[PDB]
Amino acid sequence: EIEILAEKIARWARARSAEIERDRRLPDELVTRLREAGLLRATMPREVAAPELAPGRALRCAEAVARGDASAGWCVSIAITSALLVAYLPARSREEMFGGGRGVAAGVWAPRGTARSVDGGVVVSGRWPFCSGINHADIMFAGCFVDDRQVPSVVALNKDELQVLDTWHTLGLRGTGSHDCVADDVFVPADRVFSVFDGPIVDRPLYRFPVFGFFALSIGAAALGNARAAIDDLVELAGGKKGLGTTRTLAERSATQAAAATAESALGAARALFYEVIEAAWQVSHDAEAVPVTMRNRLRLAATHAVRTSADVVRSMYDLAGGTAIYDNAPLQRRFRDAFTATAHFQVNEASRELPGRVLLDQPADVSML
Ligand SMILES: Cc1cc2nc3c(=O)[nH]c(=O)nc-3n(C[C@H](O)[C@@H](O)[C@H](O)COP(=O)(O)O)c2cc1C
Ligand SMILES: CCc1cc(C(=N)S)ccn1
């Protein structure tokens, strides 16, 4: 049923999409809707009054919201990924920050922070770009290195303690407000410092599902929903777009027909693989052993394929629309700008094909972050 709420919320995001972009943030009323549906805490554990939603359902919700507006969808993706880390907190700090239904999380994985140990915890400083959703998050999980360690850690920071810098001036995904955040000698109690590589404290199937795979897949979900919206925009425009020569509509051209078919099947294929691998990994997340590397590899293969295929689909629809889509009032223009902002994400760029290829070819590979 959360899926039905997500589709309703997608229609609200679509209605507000000009405001989202103009203000570089989600309207308060839209955040309230998302919160009341449980979408911004969907994957947090049941102990904090949260749905602990199965990953395929959560990702389908993000995809649905992104079809309404890619930035709104991306904020769901980042919220439901960051929410997983609530399962890595000791019970005391988990209750403090997320108990009784409280707390929305943001999260930047890049270990930009430097943390020094002190009596009771660490003192951390750093600057993190790409803090999606910080405008409506209470807590930001941030990567850092603690003293001498060569394996990075995560600190759970209150937004209160950070300086948010106005840096998010971007081609697309403007509504994500993915600004830089700065910590200046912030004290973090020891029980808000952890290592993802040590695994969750809440050891149930949702947190056995590959966490780095889920993050990648959440970007795929937003990209896929955006590409679906782009096809829908094209199809609506074509047929009515008549032009001024004595040929006729855009939809009546063979090239438009072949391109529509090519895009529809490419997107359908990417989406089908996406949900197939999620379900396969979800099944084995119920087993005693850690989800294996072969399965983790399939998730990363599918996430990157989804983002890259989505961009190819949106580029094709934009190109078909010709002089219509170059203007700021054209819906396809924002889809295009959003699709080509999403492609830059480090989990799903062209470079992200190389490690999953090494795994396929049985080559030596560091798979700690697969
Ligand atoms: C619109 C957008 C929002 C992003 N949000 C986050 C985030 O909240 N947390 C994170 O670890 N990465 C996030 N990323 C990943 C990086 O921002 C990605 O864009 C990066 O720029 C790729 O190169 P890099 O290695 O310099 O980070 C985001 C990326 C984009 C494009
Ligand atoms: C998601 C990629 C990544 C993860 C981490 C650790 N989880 S902190 C560090 C660097 N890069």
Numbering used by the authors: 7 to 376
Copy text verbatim from the article accompanying this structure deposition.
Our subsequent investigation of one gene cluster (Rv3093c-Rv3095) associated with ethionamide resistance that contained a putative monooxygenase/repressor pair with some resemblance to ethA/ethR, indicates that Rv3094c is likely a flavin-dependent monooxygenase that sulfoxygenates ethionamide, and Rv3095 is its transcriptional regulator. Ethionamide is a second-line anti-tubercular drug used to treat patients infected with multi-drug-resistant or extensively drug-resistant isolates, and is a pro-drug that requires metabolic activation before it can exert its cytotoxic effects. To investigate the mechanism of ethionamide sulfoxygenation by Rv3094c, we solved protein crystal structures of apo-Rv3094c, and Rv3094c in complex with FMN (Rv3094c-FMN) and ethionamide (Rv3094c-FMN-ETH), at resolutions of 1.91 Å, 2.00 Å, and 1.64 Å, respectively. All three crystals contained one tetramer per asymmetric unit, tetramers being formed by two homodimers, the C-terminal domain primarily mediating interactions between the two monomers.
Superposition of apo-Rv3094c structural homologs not only reveals strong structural conservation of overall topology, but confirms that the location of the FMN binding site, lying in the pocket between the β-sheet and the C-terminal domain, and stabilization of the flavin ring by hydrogen bonds are also conserved. Ethionamide is embedded within a hydrophobic pocket comprised of the β-barrel domain and the C-terminal helix domain and is surrounded by the hydrophobic side chains of W115, P117, P158, V202, F218, F352, Q353, and M375. To evaluate which amino acids are important in interactions between Rv3094c and FAD and/or ethionamide, we constructed mutants based on the structure of the Rv3094c-FMN-ETH complex. ETH-SO synthesis was markedly altered by mutation of either of the two residues involved in both the FAD and ethionamide pockets (F352 and W115) or those specific to the FAD (W80, S138, W174, L179, and H351) or ethionamide (P117 and V202) pockets, indicating that these residues are all important in FAD/ethionamide binding. Mutation of W115 and P117 to arginine (R) (changing the hydrophobic side chain into a hydrophilic side chain with an additional 3-carbon aliphatic straight chain) blocked ethionamide activation more notably than when these residues were mutated to alanine (A) (simply removing the large side chain). In the structure of p-Hydroxyphenylacetate (HPA) hydroxylase, a structural and functional homolog of Rv3094c, HPA passes through a gate formed by F266 to interact with FMNH-.
